Structures are given as C-alpha cells and as structure tokens.
Amino acid sequence: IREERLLKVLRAPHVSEKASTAMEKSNTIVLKVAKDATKAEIKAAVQKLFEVEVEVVNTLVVKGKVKRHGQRIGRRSDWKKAYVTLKEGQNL
Amino acid sequence: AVVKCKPTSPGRRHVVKVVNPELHKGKPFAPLLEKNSKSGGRNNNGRITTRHIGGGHKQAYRIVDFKRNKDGIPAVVERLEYDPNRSANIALVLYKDGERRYILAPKGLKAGDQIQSGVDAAIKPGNTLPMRNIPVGSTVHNVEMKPGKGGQLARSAGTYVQIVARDGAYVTLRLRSGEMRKVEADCRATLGEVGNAEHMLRVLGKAGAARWRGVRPTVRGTAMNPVDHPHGGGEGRNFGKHPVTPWGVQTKGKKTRSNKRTDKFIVRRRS
Amino acid sequence: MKRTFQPSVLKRNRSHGFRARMATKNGRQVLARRRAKGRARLTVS
RNA sequence: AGGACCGAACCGACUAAUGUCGAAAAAUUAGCGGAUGACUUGUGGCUGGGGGUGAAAGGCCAAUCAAACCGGGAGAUAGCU
RNA sequence: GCUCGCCGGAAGACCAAGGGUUCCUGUCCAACGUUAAUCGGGGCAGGGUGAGUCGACCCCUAAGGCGAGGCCGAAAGGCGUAGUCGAUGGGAAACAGGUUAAUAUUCCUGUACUUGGUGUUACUGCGAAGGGGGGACGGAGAAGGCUAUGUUGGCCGGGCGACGGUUGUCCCGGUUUAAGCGUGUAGGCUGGUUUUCCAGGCAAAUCCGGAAAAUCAAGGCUGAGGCGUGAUGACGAGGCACUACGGUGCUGAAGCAACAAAUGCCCUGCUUCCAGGAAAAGCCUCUAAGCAUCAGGUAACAUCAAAUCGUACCCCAAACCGACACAGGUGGUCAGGUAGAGAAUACCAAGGCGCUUGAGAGAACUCGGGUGAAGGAACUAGGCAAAAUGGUGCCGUAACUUCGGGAGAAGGCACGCUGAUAUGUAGGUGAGGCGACUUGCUCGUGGAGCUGAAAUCAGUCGAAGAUACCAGCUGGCUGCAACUGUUUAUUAAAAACACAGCACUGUGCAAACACGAAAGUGGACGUAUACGGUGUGACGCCUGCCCGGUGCCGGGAGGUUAAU
Numbered sequence A: 001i002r003e004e005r006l007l008k009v010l011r012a013p014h015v016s017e018k019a020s021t022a023m024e025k026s027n028t029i030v031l032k033v034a035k036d037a038t039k040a041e042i043k044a045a046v047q048k049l050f051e052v053e054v055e056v057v058n059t060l061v062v063k064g065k066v067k068r069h070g071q072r073i074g075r076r077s078d079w080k081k082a083y084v085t086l087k088e089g090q091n092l
Numbered sequence B: 001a002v003v004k005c006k007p008t009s010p011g012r013r014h015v016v017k018v019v020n021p022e023l024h025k026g027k028p029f030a031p032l033l034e035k036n037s038k039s040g041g042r043n044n045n046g047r048i049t050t051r052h053i054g055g056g057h058k059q060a061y062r063i064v065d066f067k068r069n070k071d072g073i074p075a076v077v078e079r080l081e082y083d084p085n086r087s088a089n090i091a092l093v094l095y096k097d098g099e100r101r102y103i104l105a106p107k108g109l110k111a112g113d114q115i116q117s118g119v120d121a122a123i124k125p126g127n128t129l130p131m132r133n134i135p136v137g138s139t140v141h142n143v144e145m146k147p148g149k150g151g152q153l154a155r156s157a158g159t160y161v162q163i164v165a166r167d168g169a170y171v172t173l174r175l176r177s178g179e180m181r182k183v184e185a186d187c188r189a190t191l192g193e194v195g196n197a198e199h200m201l202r203v204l205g206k207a208g209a210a211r212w213r214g215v216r217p218t219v220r221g222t223a224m225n226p227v228d229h230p231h232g233g234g235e236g237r238n239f240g241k242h243p244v245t246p247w248g249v250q251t252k253g254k255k256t257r258s259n260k261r262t263d264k265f266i267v268r269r270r271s
Numbered sequence C: 001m002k003r004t005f006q007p008s009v010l011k012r013n014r015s016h017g018f019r020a021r022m023a024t025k026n027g028r029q030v031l032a033r034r035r036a037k038g039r040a041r042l043t044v045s
Numbered sequence D: 001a002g003g004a005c006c007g008a009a010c011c012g013a014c015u016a017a018u019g020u021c022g023a024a025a026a027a028u029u030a031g032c033g034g035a036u037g038a039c040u041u042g043u044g045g046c047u048g049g050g051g052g053u054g055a056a057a058g059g060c061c062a063a064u065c066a067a068a069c070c071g072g073g074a075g076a077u078a079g080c081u
Numbered sequence E: 001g002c003u004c005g006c007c008g009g010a011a012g013a014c015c016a017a018g019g020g021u022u023c024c025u026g027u028c029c030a031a032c033g034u035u036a037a038u039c040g041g042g043g044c045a046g047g048g049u050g051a052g053u054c055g056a057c058c059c060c061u062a063a064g065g066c067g068a069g070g071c072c073g074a075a076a077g078g079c080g081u082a083g084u085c086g087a088u089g090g091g092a093a094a095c096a097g098g099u100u101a102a103u104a105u106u107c108c109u110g111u112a113c114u115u116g117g118u119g120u121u122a123c124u125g126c127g128a129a130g131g132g133g134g135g136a137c138g139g140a141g142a143a144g145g146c147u148a149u150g151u152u153g154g155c156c157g158g159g160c161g162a163c164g165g166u167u168g169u170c171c172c173g174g175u176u177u178a179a180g181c182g183u184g185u186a187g188g189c190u191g192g193u194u195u196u197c198c199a200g201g202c203a204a205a206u207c208c209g210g211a212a213a214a215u216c217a218a219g220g221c222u223g224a225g226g227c228g229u230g231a232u233g234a235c236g237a238g239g240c241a242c243u244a245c246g247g248u249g250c251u252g253a254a255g256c257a258a259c260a261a262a263u264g265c266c267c268u269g270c271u272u273c274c275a276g277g278a279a280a281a282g283c284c285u286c287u288a289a290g291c292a293u294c295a296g297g298u299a300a301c302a303u304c305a306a307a308u309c310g311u312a313c314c315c316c317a318a319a320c321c322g323a324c325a326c327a328g329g330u331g332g333u334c335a336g337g338u339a340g341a342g343a344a345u346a347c348c349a350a351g352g353c354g355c356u357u358g359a360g361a362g363a364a365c366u367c368g369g370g371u372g373a374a375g376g377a378a379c380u381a382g383g384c385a386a387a388a389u390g391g392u393g394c395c396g397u398a399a400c401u402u403c404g405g406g407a408g409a410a411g412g413c414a415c416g417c418u419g420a421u422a423u424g425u426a427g428g429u430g431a432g433g434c435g436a437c438u439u440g441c442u443c444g445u446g447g448a449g450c451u452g453a454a455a456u457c458a459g460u461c462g463a464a465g466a467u468a469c470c471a472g473c474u475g476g477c478u479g480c481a482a483c484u485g486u487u488u489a490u491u492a493a494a495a496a497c498a499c500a501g502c503a504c505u506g507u508g509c510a511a512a513c514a515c516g517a518a519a520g521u522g523g524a525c526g527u528a529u530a531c532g533g534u535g536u537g538a539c540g541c542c543u544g545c546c547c548g549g550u551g552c553c554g555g556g557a558g559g560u561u562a563a564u
C-alpha cells in the first residue's frame, strides 16, 4: 500500500510543551510531515515505520515567519504538522 | 371601474386607478411563466441605446399565444389575469384536450366563456380565423402580417383593426393610426376588440408612479449645455434653433419612413 | 473619509491578474513589457 | 391607504462657530432636512476618453476633467521670459 | 493593590471584507513610541492555528464572462449557438460541558446525527441528454400562539451590621443544563379515494392535464412551542485542600413557580394591495433507448469511509481604507437593569477602558461654557448668534381651501407624594378542583395566587411636581416654484433639474431611433390606449392676430441642373 514513498512523509518528531502535554494525557504524537502527505499517508506511515496502532490523524499547515538579516527580508518555509492520536497500545 | 383616488396626500390627489374587479387575485399559472431580466436600455456593447428606461418593479414573462395554432378544438376561458409586461389583460384559456395557454383578453369575455379557433368555427368575439373567412367590415385584433406567424397588429388595450375591403388574395385593413394597409388574406385575426379599454384613463399622479413602471426622467435639451444637446446654452432660457433630436435630425414634422420594400402594401398613409 | 482604494482581492485579480492579462493581446504585451524591463512582480498575484 | 405626520438607526449637508503650516488635501461642536421610498445599503457585473455616464452642475469617470491617466511621436513648437 | 472617573444599541462580545503573525512566552530598549520607559502592536529567539458535521473546495444556477463550429470584420479581431465558468442566491449532518500561556461546534468526556462504497440478506421492474411535480419567491398590514430574556416569590447556602436602628415583610448570593430522539399540539393548507376514458405535456408513460363517474365523509400535508427522555449525569454558591502566597487538587446544597415579554420563532402562513413579485440542481415521480435467473431497485444487520484547503490575532480599529499609534471612512450578528412610547435620553450591569508628555501658575487675549441690575433688536446688510418655546390627557381652535386640510392653528387648564374608593379597582390572568369527552399537548366550567393601569375624593411638602436628561417658538402680509424628490464630491440646495399632467411631431414592425465599417444588439420577446423625439410643467380660468423671413410638409407642369 504505497511502498517506498511512505518513507518520505514523516520528517521529524516535533518538540514543544503542547507536544509534551499531548504525549501522556491525550496519547498522541506531534510530528512534522511533508507538505503533500494526506492524513491516510501519515497514518499508514506511522503504522509501518513507528509501528503503533493509530486511532486518527489531525493535520495542519503552519505558515512561515517573515524574519530579517540586516536588510534583505526573508520568509521561512510553510511546513505541515500532524497531531497523530494513538490507541491504548502506545509507546513512542 | 375607473376610480379616482381621494386627496389624503399630495401625490395621491390626482391618482386615477383602473380597478377591474373580474381579474384573478392570486399567483399565475407557472408553466407559462418565465424570467424577463431588464436591459436598462443598454445593448450588446453595454451602452444606452434607448434613453429613459431603467429600474421599475421586477416582472415575469407570460408566454402569450399570438399564433393560435389549435384548429377545431374548443377552449373554455378559466380566468382573466393581470399581465405586467402588457397594456392589455390576458385570459387563461383551457383547451378541451388538456392544454392551457394565455391569450390577449378581448372586450366581451369572462371566466366561463367558450372560444374556438381554426378554419371553420363561428363568427364571434375571441374566435381566431383566417381573414378570408371573416366578413368584410368587421372589427378584429391580434392580426398577423404574414401567414403562419404570430400576430403583430392591434394587441394593445382597446385597440382593434377594421377590415375595409377584400381584393382576391389581399385584404385591406384600416389600422388604429388611420393607415390603410394591405395584408394577405391567409393571415389570421382574432375577432373583436382588445379588452381593458379603460387603460388610457389611468393618470399615475406622481413621479414615483412612472419610476416603478420602469421609466427614468427625461431631461429637456434646452436645460443642457451646447456640448450635450443641439438646444443648449444661452444665458437664461434661450432657444432660437429649429427643434431637433440629440443627434441633430429635425423632429417636429420630418418624415423618417424609408422602408421602400414595404411601401407596396401601404394603400394610404395615416393622417 | 471613503477613499479611492477600497480593497478586494477578487476584484483585484479579476481586474489586474495574470489570467486577466493573459486573456487579451494588449494584456499579453503588458506582461511582455514587464518581462522585458525585467520585473519581479510580473502581475499582482 | 399614503413619493402621509413626529422621531432614533441609516442616508444627507441648511446656519453658525472652531479649524485654515488643521486632529482632517472638506473635518469637528451646537442646532438642521429625509427617514416605507423617485429610500438606503453589502457583494458581484456592464458602460472607456470626443468616449462613457449625467432628475443637466460642464457634474462625475481613482484627492486629476470645456475632453482622464501611462507610454510613445518628442529635444513638438515659443518672433516670449 | 485600594479608591476615583468614563463608555455601556458601546469606547462591550462575535464575525465577513481587508490585513497576514500584529497572537502567547522568554529576553533586549540603540532606532521606532510625538516625553521617560523596566512596558510595548518595537528588536531578537522560541511557541501557537488539530474538523465527515463551521467555512472553503464540491452538485446547481442570476447578472454577466468566455465561447468548438458558425455569421461578420483590411489584419488585430466583433458577435454569438451547443457548452463551460460565474455568489452576493439554492443544495447532507453536532451539541452541552471540560481544557492551553496561546486553538477549539476542530482537542477531551458524555450523548448524537448525515451521505457514500462494499457487503449481506428477505423482497421486487429498473432504466435517461427525456416528461411532470417540487424547489419557488413582492409590498404593506394585522392578529393570535410562543420563546430568548427579564422581574418577583419560594427554595437553598451564608450574614446579624465600623454611626442611631436591623432574628426580620430583613440583607447578600445562588436557583443552571444543549443538539438529538420521542411526542404532532397553538394552529395553518386541502374534499378523499376507486375505476374507466381522452386529437394534450414534440416520442412513451400507471406521472401530470382533461372528461365521466361511483362512493365514505374525512384522510393527508405542514408546524412554533411545550412536555418526556438526553441528564444516579453536566454544572453548581461557598468550602476545603494546600501555597511554588501562581494556585494545584477534593467534594459541592437548592437546583422550583408565577408574572411580564420581544423588532426573535410559527409566519416561505393569513388578510389585503397593486407597481403583479429570479433561475437552475439536490429531492420526488413517470416512462423511452434498453435490460429480463441477470445487472439493476427496496428495505434491514453490517462494514469501510468521509480526502484537500482556512482556522492564531485585529476586525467602527494603534493591526483595514486615509503617507502617521490620523478627532475621518468601514458590512453583518448579539441587544441585561431602573425610569421612558423608545435601539431616544439619563444613571448603571456584564465587560472594557482613563484617549503615551507632565508639573506649576491662575495676566492680557483666544477658544468652549455659566450667570447677570435697568432697558429689550436701540445691534446688524439681516434678530446672524444666543435666549425662548418643548411632554401627556382634556377643553378649544379663525380666514382660506383642491373639502383632505390649514391644525400641534391660536390659547388654555390638569400634572409631585401619601392615604382612601379598592388589607392593590376595571382589566390581564390563570391554578387546586369538578363535569365530562374518551385516550388527549381534551372540551367547559371554576376562579387560589401573581399582575396591574386610569381615575375620582381627601390630605400633604416645596419658591417651583411634564421639577434632571429629553422635548415645536408663535402669528399676519407677500414674490417664486404646485407638491415628495434631484443638483455644482471639495465656496452656489435655489426661483435651477425632475415631476405627474398637457400639446405638437415622428414611427405599420425587417418600426422610427440608438450603439455598431458589419454581423448583430437595444427599442421589445413590446406593436399606435404602443414606442421615440421636442417643448411646456399639478390643479382652476384660458391660450388671441401674422405663413412676408427661416424651417418643415405637400405638389408636380415649366425654368435651370450631375454623373452617363
């Protein structure tokens, strides 16, 4: 079910307070995904790579901040994060 | 009846309404209705071709039957209705077979009366016949200029054509203008006079009445500046030029008929 | 107090957008010009 | 019933004062007119420059109008400063 | 932190548009901030936007746009047909509570619902580029039934007075709960069926339309609400608990009744009027081309699914439009108390703010206000400006009139508070009862409580009782314009424009005329009781003479007369 490509979806685990509070209490994992990456493709990726029972994936697109570097203005890249809820069989 | 309105307000004072009691108080027959969106007097190019039109009340088109294609089928008049896109009233005719159509209501007509149309039929108001079969010296309306077509002449309230003479294939008609026109005898004509003759006795009474009829204000040439209209300028109410349209063609007695094709059919021009 | 610029992104793009310029021969020459001059913002988009 | 009456919202702009390098390239304060209609307003269309639109003032058409704006002819032309 | 002040139909709370990180935390004050700044919408890091149900995308269309062929046009290209786009409109479904420093109808808990695929199964005619139905519609008005919401009792927990009183008719606080599902009411709307038959709805139809009937009188449809579940729940005023004086984490009582009441909802309804009030899909239904154990429908237990994008924050503003942290502009939604007719106004609640230079002094003069002896328009171009009048009820109200008006003419009088009539009245209002009528959200008594004007009479205080805010100045003669309306955005609002009405005139429909090299469009899906142009400008009384001149119209002999 969409082999090879699934590996390119998940970029990194997200580190934050909101990310931490949703580990123990809500039983989810926040993580940075590819700008494409549908909820099915994230779920299916977590199901094989991380190998845990996924309840549901909620997804959102974060907009890049407009920073500075003296004169030349620059905008950061629009990355996409995925709150992935897990089932009772959880770990990481 | 033609009821004058009481002067409870300036603007009401001069109002004179044409209150027809027989008309239907209710929504019309939907299958014959369709949309009729307004132009505002502008065309393809989006420009005012005809001035002084715009706004007014929204109004739906009733598909009125000018052709009268049903031959030898009787038809009962179900109810008379108000038509907002027309001077005359209309009658919801129910054909014996099942069909319903709107027609222009003639004078002597009510909810219940029977109408037949075709070749034979009877000589009576409302019945549509070819002008060959119709007796000479008789009042008709909704007259076709071309056989098989709709019905062009005398469709306005109280309007009627009189058949003067009958020269073989042609029929000489005296029209409401005073013009005597020669049409083909095969063309049809609905017998009698078009109803709602009181229409012209209506007097609106206020500016707003014309506005909600879709008319906009006419500004006199003389009021304008010379750049705008041939009558124009002057320091305080001048004129001193011959009356003319905004495009300089003379009005006020200046023949603009120039068809040439149809001049053969016109027996005698109006006066 | 009711100024000339009353912004609307739909109107903006319908009036001055890339496709609105692409629709017409005169509009394609505008783009041709901005490209020739070498602009970054070829149209408002 | 009403282009009816009084009167808030809303739309307007009659008078006065202030302001006039303003708080504001047209406003404020106190009064003022319309306020179910020819009303008002949101959103989206259409009309293009001798052209539009104009209940007509030469009004309005992006703070520009007896002929918009931008580029070009173009270093127009100037018996004038 | 405690006072004080201000807004409160906003200066509060949600949005759309538009912005585009301005949101939150930590840190830093060079510049930015009209002053200082430890603070900041500033700098710099990091964090923050979680959807089958909200919106967008998606199915459908209006105005309009584009437009295969096509018609038209020196070229460019214009118009437009089948189509395809285009919301500001139509079309499936989720709520209450809890939660973050920053999101929540999206996370969480408890309850729900909606459309699909693929099954399973019993049962069966399905099937359109097609027909019919529905969607599906205006203004105004009126009335009833409701609800949001409030108020007052009861009830429950606390209180016993910083200064005389206060164990009470006393004081403070609370009295909350949704979609869903069940119920089908106040009420709206409609004669049901059953059979046959028929030149109609381009074909076909059992559907729609029409025509016979026969036959019981109702059967459907729509619908607020309320009640019952939802809800041994949720929540709940204080307590306790701990203190990192941030709060963390435990419980948690009553949790009712009457009255009042919308501009909300039934009502897309009803009555009425004319100026006569989108479209198209979803939806329901009928059959053609077909298909006939079939595929297809129908139902029911499943099951799998419901992708993508927006979601922070401002949003009458220091974040949008105005060059500014600008005394301007900016669409929708929510609408608490007391007084009041009220969304006016005053004072307040929720909630939010004190407008990013202050401190003194208390000259002239300027600005915005208050008061003023005697006089009272003598000012001045002009009562400009100020002052004054102002509410409700009742009495009264002239010429003139188009018979409506004028008219709120004018001008008067009464208004507070307290008892009484009446331990709160007519009125509204409805309970425990009791007929009964059946199965009800019943009819009709019945009138316990709450609610409550307006009066009259008698007292009574003040200088003044519509005591504040709020809230006409009035009359006479007269020019112009009938009137409401429109107008020089930014020195002119008028007698100017428009106007209903009036006349002349053109126009016989491939209409005149207008836009357009043209095709073609408007006029008009109109047809002389119509349409265009011109002037005049309600209404009443009228509108006189001149056709030499200029135009226009008609006439065709004669003169002159181009191209050929």
Ligand SMILES: [Mg+2]
Pocket: none
């Ligand atoms: Mg769920």
Ligand SMILES: [Mg+2]
Pocket: A056, A058
């Ligand atoms: Mg979820």
Ligand SMILES: [Mg+2]
Pocket: A059, A060
């Ligand atoms: Mg999302």
Ligand SMILES: [Mg+2]
Pocket: A063
């Ligand atoms: Mg964002």
Ligand SMILES: [Mg+2]
Pocket: A064, A075, A076, A077
């Ligand atoms: Mg980038």
Ligand SMILES: [Mg+2]
Pocket: A076, A077
């Ligand atoms: Mg980065």
Ligand SMILES: [Mg+2]
Pocket: none
């Ligand atoms: Mg890059």
Ligand SMILES: [Mg+2]
Pocket: none
């Ligand atoms: Mg109706």
Ligand SMILES: [Mg+2]
Pocket: B039
């Ligand atoms: Mg048309």
Ligand SMILES: [Mg+2]
Pocket: B044, B045, B046
């Ligand atoms: Mg065009």
Ligand SMILES: [Mg+2]
Pocket: B044
């Ligand atoms: Mg076009």
Ligand SMILES: [Mg+2]
Pocket: B043, B044, B045, B046, D046
């Ligand atoms: Mg156009």
Ligand SMILES: [Mg+2]
Pocket: B049, B050, B051, E513, E514, E532
């Ligand atoms: Mg015209």
Ligand SMILES: [Mg+2]
Pocket: B051, B052, B218
């Ligand atoms: Mg006209």
Ligand SMILES: [Mg+2]
Pocket: B084, B085, B086
């Ligand atoms: Mg019409």
Ligand SMILES: [Mg+2]
Pocket: B218
């Ligand atoms: Mg006129």
